């Protein structure tokens, strides 16, 4: 019996917690003697202040204290972000406010003053009574007029952002010797993750001062490292506790001003502090994303093959870096080329500042915005060259042949180098088999008195190792069960299930008996976290050589327990059959026997100096094509997405049932970005989309009756097991394909630039009939 | 979140309610449903000192076919409009119109009496009820008024209800017999506050001219709007894509809407325009009986 | 200045407690009736999670002051499970991976509950979508939920 578990559809381990409601979330936590923090936020977009009136706030009963800026610029550093630095140069700042500075305000929703009261009702009751008089300054909003820079945000100025540049060989000759040279600029919409759980933090101090407990949800819960350094009380003593999270999409990823204010205030009062975000707040305070300006250029010959490709990008970072370091901007500038033959290139990314909510990293950050413009310049190019988008992408995709194809673009640091180590294979048979699966041609064939069709491709910077390591640990027990410690984090995508399978496979124990513990920094003093579709080959790779450390620790230890040497039958139950077929020793009894007999019955080998797990220089790049067909009502602005199918090649799907969730779910978040979601600021500076009535989240009825999934496990990469990151591959080309279809269905020019596609824009067909 | 502090009471009777909030507050408010008041509280956009819960008062809950009209209690739930009588002539337009009001969860607690007194510019009910020529009885401590729907709707979020007084019941006249009623709206997602919508109702002359027509507009200004002159076109004239198109294209010329987030001014005028003719389409067909179907 | 005494039935257990009128039902059902099962996402009758059974009808625990619920039956997601055995709705939701994060699970489940318990109707993909539509999710999106609900209604009725 060699029961296999990886690749199998097994129902999630997380399911029952969430279904019954036994699972606790950050907002669910209660601690006796709690104080409830409410935050007085900005009402100006750009303003310096004189704030001294919390008098009637301080004097309403039930309120224990009101925290001003002067409390917190103290010690009271300003929000550091970490490695990925060089640095070039420099950093400060942003970081955010970073904590309430008693001088200037750089966006509506910025923390200025925190109150502390007994119940959250009384907390904001006192928050109203706080008065701050403002000097309104001029307001910056357009990324392009940020750097043509009058109206400077920082008085030190403090050039807006960081300028990233990457460019191969001889693009001067690649362009100069081209027949069709194509220039167009694209604009992406400002939108984010907007998960269902708003941000929430609970801090309990151990006033014995020794320590501090944080049931806050800080999204690398092993980034106590920041709070520690900031508060100067490091590094244990800041012991983080595990909580379930209601979705993040990287939008919650990192340290916020709220996190430190609470932690500081908790420490210096010896009193537990609780914080729970407004949705409204979330819309003006939680990290933004997606807003770019994509000037692009192409070099093409009479064949239609690529020769040269690129110009400048303007990433609008909002007002501040927020562990939203060039990281994403650096990634974006690395992969606006995707999985194509691109002889040369010229990135000049301008990460810039405006009076908006500080930009973090939304699901597939910088790659939704880039694979849009890239596929919106390719579609446009087919208009002049004259012939099909299908057979353009078809023969200048990614020659292989070529593979390994060390590019092709830069000067390749994505995010460091060198890459693209595209050792993973056949670029094309995906697109080929993806349309041989099976329609596309079948309703390009349309009697089409309705409307039309679209395409788009997405490669992914999706195992950001991180580099070198990731920790893991497996433990067998006296009670039948198995325990797995990991540096992973259940944002709700099924890590605790995937790892259980990985361990199940290697240990020959049902994934039911295995439990997984994460984000509890007392058990797990070191872990990396969960971002950039990574946690399987990294943390699952940790789980493997952990479970593989026990099998030796056990099988070796079992040969000593009976007297048979390490050869037997073949050895799994999980237990130990020597011979064929006398006797046996179970895997748990082995562990139960290693008690206080001079020892210990467990493993945790990742890692040491010269790390473990080892994933270094080159990450895997998964690639995928999205296929869409839309109908449109022209007398109004309506549309009904008739068909949808994202198909992505990624070696070794670990859990097919759950990966389907990660593909479909993401794809919808893409349609949300493509046709519904935009943060609208009024020309003076105030946010307009603050409620849910304004910001449009896709609902059940409007979505495609099915997103089809075409994944194949050809060409496993060489990081055993040969698997890929898949938690982002849904949204990548969701924007471009929708756009192409809309332009194909009208039909004028293939000339759409700005997302989203509002119903007002989409009667420019009233023009067509006129 | 976090609504302001207030005192709270449940009224026993229709004049008990009037009696208490009168001396209770210059700024005492009524509640009933909550789906508009309670959220206005979590946004701290309202500061009642006293809240009067009338949601538990006997009479105002039923539906009657009195005389040549139809009586509806003010506390009648949106859901009990999609169900069940429903009412006479039934479907009337309302079960077709209420089916747009947000979702079942909200429709389960939102009252007709609330939406009319709240009077959101984009509220689906008043738009319909104006096309039916509604009549709203409003009891007060002093006496009892009856106000037609035309004067009632003042502005967005403003009604002509005097402070203190209470909307008791809405009665709609049961129109003619065998007439056409339809309602359609456009919105990004099914159930959102619509960009543009229309409710058109046609009565056939059989011999088949048009005897009477009433037309209203969702989101033409600050309130529902009768297109009294666009109706004049249809009168005496028959069927026809053109008379329909001519009627619809002439209902929007007198309209200046508000923007911006979901659409611009002239934009909405053109969406409403296709809403009028489209409703007029099914405003026939439904007008066919003589039954035997 | 003003305290109010609640006499409410919650998931069977009747409670008597004094609460300030302004506390919302959601906050009351989480404190101190520590039934964290009910979850709060939006703040104005949209997110869905909010949703609870009030007197048989699904309403938002978030547009109702706790005080308005006096002398009424209330049921939350905690009340589905009956002696270890997950209520079939919960089973098919896991059988079809109808949930990844957890938030949009109280909301949908409680919306679907009275619909389930009453003998009609069938729920086909189209009518299934319309049913859950009152609840938002940012993870699935719905495809599997719609697939999950349908499955639940087949083992319900036609059932071998
Ligand atoms: C087109 C449309 C879209 C909608 N969309 C949404 C949505 O997206 N989300 C949502 O949550 N809800 C929505 N609603 C519901 C809307 O809030 C309704 O007004 C609902 O009925 C609110 O409950 P209520 O008005 O009965 O009680 P409340 O909302 O408590 O009433 C609010 C106000 O009405 C007054 N009032 C109520 N009854 C009376 C009376 N008998 N006499 C005098 N004054 C009275 C009160 O003084 C109070 O100030 C929508 C409704 C419509 C028509
Ligand atoms: N059942 C699964 C789950 C994940 N994977 C893949 O294996 C890795 C393990 O996941 P993880 O490392 O956590 O991926 P990320 O750290 O990038 O996070 C997951 C991904 O997809 C997500 N899925 C989410 N789902 C829910 N319900 N809620 C969130 O907040 C989520 N947030 C995310 C975010 S953020 C991203 S980017 C990922 O590469 C994923 O593609 C898989 O094969 N099978
Ligand atoms: S938060 Fe109360 S309904 Fe969404
Ligand atoms: S809401 Fe995040 S998983 Fe459904
Ligand atoms: Mo992410």
Curated annotation (Swiss-Prot), chain A:
The keyword Lipid metabolism does not apply. It catalyses: 6-hydroxypseudooxynicotine + A + H2O = 2,6-dihydroxypseudooxynicotine + AH2. InterPro entries: Ald_Oxase/Xan_DH_a/b (IPR000674), Ald_Oxase/Xan_DH_a/b_sf (IPR036856), Ald_Oxase/xanthine_DH-like (IPR016208), AldOxase/xan_DH_MoCoBD1 (IPR008274), AldOxase/xan_DH_MoCoBD2 (IPR046867), AldOxase/xan_DH_Mopterin-bd_sf (IPR037165). Keywords: Metal-binding, Molybdenum, Oxidoreductase, Plasmid. Pathway: Alkaloid degradation; nicotine degradation. PANTHER family: ALDEHYDE OXIDASE 1-RELATED, XANTHINE DEHYDROGENASE. This is 6-hydroxypseudooxynicotine dehydrogenase complex subunit gamma. It comes from Paenarthrobacter nicotinovorans.
Swiss-Prot record, chain B:
PROSITE patterns: FAD_PCMH (PS51387). FAD binds at residues 30-37, 111-115, 124. Binds 1 FAD per subunit. It comes from the Bacteria. Keywords: FAD, Flavoprotein, Oxidoreductase, Plasmid. GO terms for molecular function: 6-hydroxypseudooxynicotine dehydrogenase activity; FAD binding. The keyword Acetylation does not apply. Pathway: Alkaloid degradation; nicotine degradation. It holds the Pfam family FAD_binding_5. Transmembrane segments: none annotated. Gene3D superfamilies: 3.30.465.10, CO dehydrogenase flavoprotein, C-terminal domain, Uridine Diphospho-n-acetylenolpyruvylglucosamine Reductase, domain 2. InterPro entries: CO_DH_flav_C, CO_DH_flav_C_dom_sf, Diverse_Substr_Oxidored, FAD-bd_PCMH, FAD-bd_PCMH-like_sf, FAD-bd_PCMH_sub1, FAD-bd_PCMH_sub2, Mopterin_DH_FAD-bd. Its cofactor is FAD. GO terms for biological process: nicotine catabolic process. It catalyses: 6-hydroxypseudooxynicotine + A + H2O = 2,6-dihydroxypseudooxynicotine + AH2. Residues 1-177 form the FAD-binding PCMH-type domain. Its EC number is 1.5.99.14. Heterohexamer of 2 alpha (kdhA), 2 beta (kdhB) and 2 gamma (kdhC) subunit. Dimer of heterotrimers. Molybdo-flavoprotein enzyme complex involved in nicotine degradation. The subunit gamma (large subunit) contains the substrate-binding sites, the subunit alpha (medium subunit) binds FAD and the subunit beta (small subunit) has a 2Fe-2S ferredoxin-type domain which binds 2 2Fe-2S clusters. This is 6-hydroxypseudooxynicotine dehydrogenase complex subunit alpha.
Curated annotation (Swiss-Prot), chain C:
Residues 4-80 form the 2Fe-2S ferredoxin-type domain. Its EC number is 1.5.99.14. CDD domains: fer2. [2Fe-2S] cluster 2 binds at residues 101, 104, 137, 139. It catalyses: 6-hydroxypseudooxynicotine + A + H2O = 2,6-dihydroxypseudooxynicotine + AH2. Pathway: Alkaloid degradation; nicotine degradation. Pfam families: Fer2, Fer2_2. PROSITE patterns: 2FE2S_FER_1 (PS00197), 2FE2S_FER_2 (PS51085). [2Fe-2S] cluster 1 binds at residues 42, 47, 50, 62. Its cofactor is [2Fe-2S] cluster. Binds 2 [2Fe-2S] clusters. Keywords: 2Fe-2S, Iron, Iron-sulfur, Metal-binding, Oxidoreductase, Plasmid. GO terms for biological process: nicotine catabolic process. One of its GO terms (molecular function) is metal ion binding. Heterohexamer of 2 alpha (kdhA), 2 beta (kdhB) and 2 gamma (kdhC) subunit. Dimer of heterotrimers. Molybdo-flavoprotein enzyme complex involved in nicotine degradation. The subunit gamma (large subunit) contains the substrate-binding sites, the subunit alpha (medium subunit) binds FAD and the subunit beta (small subunit) has a 2Fe-2S ferredoxin-type domain which binds 2 2Fe-2S clusters. This is 6-hydroxypseudooxynicotine dehydrogenase complex subunit beta.
């Amino acid at each position: 019996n060699r029961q296999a578990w990886i690749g199998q559809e097994v129902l999630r381990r997380e399911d029952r917690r969430l279904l019954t409601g036994t699972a606790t979330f950050a907002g669910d936590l209660g601690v006796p003697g709690q104080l409830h923090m409410r935050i007085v936020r900005s009402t100006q977009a750009h303003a310096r202040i004189v704030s001294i009136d919390a008098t009637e706030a301080e004097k309403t009963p039930g309120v224990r204290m009101v925290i001003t800026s002067e409390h917190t610029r103290h010690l009271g550093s300003v929000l550091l972000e970490e490695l990925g630095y060089h640095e070039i140069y420099e950093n400060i700042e942003d970081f955010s406010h970073p904590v309430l500075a008693v001088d200037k305000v750089l966006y509506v929703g910025q923390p200025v003053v925190a109150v502390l009261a007994v119940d959250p009702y009384l907390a904001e009751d006192a928050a109203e009574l706080v008065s701050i008089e403002y000097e309104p300054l001029p307001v910056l909003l357009d990324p392009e007029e940020a750097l043509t820079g009058k109206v400077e945000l920082f008085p030190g100025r403090g050039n807006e952002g960081a300028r990233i540049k990457k460019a191969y060989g001889d693009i001067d000759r690649a362009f100069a010797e081209a027949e069709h040279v194509i220039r167009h600029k694209y604009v992406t919409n400002r939108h984010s993750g907007v998960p269902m759980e708003p941000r929430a933090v609970v801090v309990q101090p151990d006033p014995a001062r020794d320590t501090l407990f944080i049931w806050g949800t800080v999204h690398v819960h092993d980034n106590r490292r920041i709070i520690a350094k900031m508060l100067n009380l490091p590094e244990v003593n800041v012991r983080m506790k595990h909580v379930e999270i209601g979705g993040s999409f990287g939008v919650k990823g990192g340290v916020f001003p709220e996190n430190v204010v609470a932690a500081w205030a908790a420490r210096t009062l010896g009193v537990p502090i609780k914080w729970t975000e407004d949705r409204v707040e979330h819309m003006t305070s939680t990290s933004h994303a997606r807003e770019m300006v994509h000037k692009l250029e192409l070099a093409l010959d009479a064949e239609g093959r690529i020769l040269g490709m690129k110009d400048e990008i303007f990433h609008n970072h909002g007002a501040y870096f927020r562990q939203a370091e060039p990281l994403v901007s650096d990634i974006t500038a690395g992969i606006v080329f995707g999985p194509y033959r691109v002889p040369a290139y010229d990135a000049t990314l301008h990460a810039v500042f405006t009076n908006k909510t500080p930009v973090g990293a939304y699901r597939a950050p910088g790659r939704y915005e880039s694979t849009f413009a890239r596929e919106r310049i390719f579609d446009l190019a087919c208009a002049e060259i004259g012939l099909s988008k299908t057979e353009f992408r078809r023969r200048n995709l990614l020659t292989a042949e070529d593979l390994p194809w060390t590019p092709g673009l830069d000067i390749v640091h994505e995010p460091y180098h060198f890459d693209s180590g595209d050792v993973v294979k056949h670029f094309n048979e995906a697109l080929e088999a993806a349309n041989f699966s099976e329609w596309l041609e079948e309703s390009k064939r349309l009697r089409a008195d309705g409307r039309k069709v679209g395409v788009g491709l997405g490669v992914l910077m999706d195992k950001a190792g991180l580099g070198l390591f990731e920790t893991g640990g497996v433990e067998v027990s006296r009670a039948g069960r198995v325990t797995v410690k990991t540096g992973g984090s259940s944002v709700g995508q099924g890590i605790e299930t995937v790892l259980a399978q990985i361990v199940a496979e290697e240990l020959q124990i049902a994934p039911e008996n295995i439990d997984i513990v994460h984000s509890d920094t007392e058990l797990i003093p070191d872990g990396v976290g969960s971002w950039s579709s990574r946690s399987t080959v990294l943390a699952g790779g940790a789980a493997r050589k952990a479970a593989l450390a026990v099998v030796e620790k056990a099988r070796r230890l079992a040969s000593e327990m009976l007297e048979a040497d390490p050869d037997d039958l073949e050895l799994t139950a999980g237990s130990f059959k020597v011979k064929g077929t006398d006797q046996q020793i179970s895997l748990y009894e082995i562990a139960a026997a290693r008690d206080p007999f001079t020892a210990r019955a467990d493993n945790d080998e990742p890692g040491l100096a010269a790390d473990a797990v080892y994933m270094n220089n080159a990450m895997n790049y998964p690639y995928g094509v999205t296929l869409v067909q839309i109908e449109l009502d022209p007398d109004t602005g309506g549309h009904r997405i008739l068909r949808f199918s994202t198909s992505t090649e990624a070696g070794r799907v670990i859990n097919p049932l759950t990966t389907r969730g990660q593909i479909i779910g993401a794809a919808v978040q893409g349609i949300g970005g493509a046709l519904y979601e935009e943060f609208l600021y009024e020309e003076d500076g105030q946010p307009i989309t603050t409620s849910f009535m304004d910001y449009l989240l896709p609902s059940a009825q409007e979505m495609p009756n099915v997103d089809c999934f075409v994944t194949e496990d050809a060409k496993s990469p060489d990081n055993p097991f040969g698997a890929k990151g898949l938690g982002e591959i849904g949204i990548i080309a969701a924007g471009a394909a929708i756009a192409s279809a809309i332009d194909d269905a009208i039909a004028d020019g293939v000339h759409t630039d700005r997302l989203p596609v509002t119903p007002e824009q989409i009667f420019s067909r009233c023009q067509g009939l006129n | 979140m976090k609504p302001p502090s207030f005192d709270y009471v449940v009224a026993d009777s229709v004049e008990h309610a009037l009696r208490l909030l009168a001396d209770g507050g210059d700024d005492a408010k009524i509640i009933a449903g909550g789906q508009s008041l309670v959220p206005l509280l979590n946004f701290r956009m309202s500061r009642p000192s006293l809240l009067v819960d009338i949601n538990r008062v006997p009479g105002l809950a039923n539906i009657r076919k009195s005389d040549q009209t139809i009586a509806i209690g003010a506390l009648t739930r949106h859901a009990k409009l999609t169900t069940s009588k429903t009412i006479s002539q039934n479907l009337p337009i309302l079960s077709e119109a209420a089916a747009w009001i947000a979702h079942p969860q909200i429709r389960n607690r939102g009252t007709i009496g609330g939406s009319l007194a709240h009077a959101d510019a984009a509220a689906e009910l008043p738009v319909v009820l104006l096309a039916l020529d509604a009549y709203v009885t409003a009891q007060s401590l002093q006496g009892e008024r009856k106000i037609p729907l035309k004067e009632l709707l003042v502005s967005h979020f403003v009604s002509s209800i005097l402070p203190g007084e209470l909307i008791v019941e809405v009665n709609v006249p049961q129109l003619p017999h065998g007439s056409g009623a339809a309602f359609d709206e456009f919105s990004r997602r099914h159930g959102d506050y619509a960009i543009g919508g229309a409710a058109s109702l046609v009565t056939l002359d059989e011999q088949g001219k048009c005897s009477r027509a009433r037309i209203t507009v969702l989101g033409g200004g600050s309130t529902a709007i009768r297109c009294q002159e666009a109706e004049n076109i249809l009168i005496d004239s028959t069927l026809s894509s053109h008379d329909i198109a001519a009627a619809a294209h002439a209902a929007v010329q007198g309209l200046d809407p508000v923007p911006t987030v979901h659409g611009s001014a002239q934009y909405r005028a053109q969406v409403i325009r296709t809403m009028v003719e489209r409703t007029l389409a099914k405003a026939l067909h439904r007008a066919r009986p003589t039954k035997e179907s | 200045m003003n305290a109010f005494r609640l006499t409410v039935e919650v998931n069977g257990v009747t409670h008597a407690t004094d609460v300030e009128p302004r506390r919302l039902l959601a906050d009351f059902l989480r404190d101190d009736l520590h039934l964290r099962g009910t979850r709060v996402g939006c703040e104005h009758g949209v997110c869905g999670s909010c949703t609870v059974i009030l007197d048989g009808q699904p309403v938002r625990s978030c547009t109702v002051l706790a005080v308005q619920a006096n002398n009424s039956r209330i049921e939350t997601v905690e009340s589905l499970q009956k002696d270890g055995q997950l209520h079939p709705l919960q089973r098919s939701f896991s059988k079809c991976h109808a949930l990844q994060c957890g938030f949009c699970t109280s909301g949908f489940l409680m919306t679907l509950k009275p619909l389930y318990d009453d003998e009609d109707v069938t729920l086909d993909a189209t009518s299934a979508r319309e049913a859950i539509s009152g609840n938002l999710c940012r993870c699935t999106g719905y495809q599997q939920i719609v697939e999950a609900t349908v499955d639940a209604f087949h083992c319900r009725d036609h059932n071998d």
